[PDB]
Design a protein around this ligand. Structure first.
Ligand code: RN5
Length: 113
């Protein structure tokens, strides 16, 4: 599958925020939330659609994002899920915001579709 130039830059941004360089921030978002493994109460009462870095990579590479905004929607969904279930004073929300600020800075430089 050949990606647009905008989505190619999105792929490279995804690999950056998912890389070992940011392992202290992204390892909580690398894989789908597992309510049983994490002992979560009411997760899907609060979160209607789960999202994580592995799933965004799958969708991107299988052609499910038509524009860079479709890709950015899922990234934003991943972080907003974390903020609203865990609370912005939680440790996981605090590292999330750090990772999102990194992503926001880079995504601003992507050319139009
Ligand atoms: C992202 C998100 O909303 N979540 C999330 C997702 C994944 C993980 C996670 C933890 C350990 C491992 C592991 O290596 O085996 C893998 C994944 C933790 C969390 C969150 N829990 C959590 C607890 C204490 C702390 C303390 C500092 S941060 C932190 C995060 C829950 C939440 C639903």
């Amino acid at each position: 599958l050949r990606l647009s130039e905008a989505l190619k830059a999105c792929s490279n941004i995804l690999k950056d925020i998912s890389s070992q360089r940011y392992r202290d921030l992204n390892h909580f978002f690398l894989k789908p939330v597992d309510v049983v493994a994490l002992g979560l109460h009411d997760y899907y009462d609060v979160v209607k659609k789960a999202m994580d870095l592995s799933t965004i990579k799958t969708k991107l590479e299988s052609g499910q994002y038509h524009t860079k905004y479709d890709f950015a929607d899922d990234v934003r969904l991943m972080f907003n899920n974390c903020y609203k279930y865990n609370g912005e004073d939680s440790e996981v929300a605090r590292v999330g915001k750090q990772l999102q600020a990194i992503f926001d800075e880079n995504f601003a430089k992507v050319p139009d579709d």
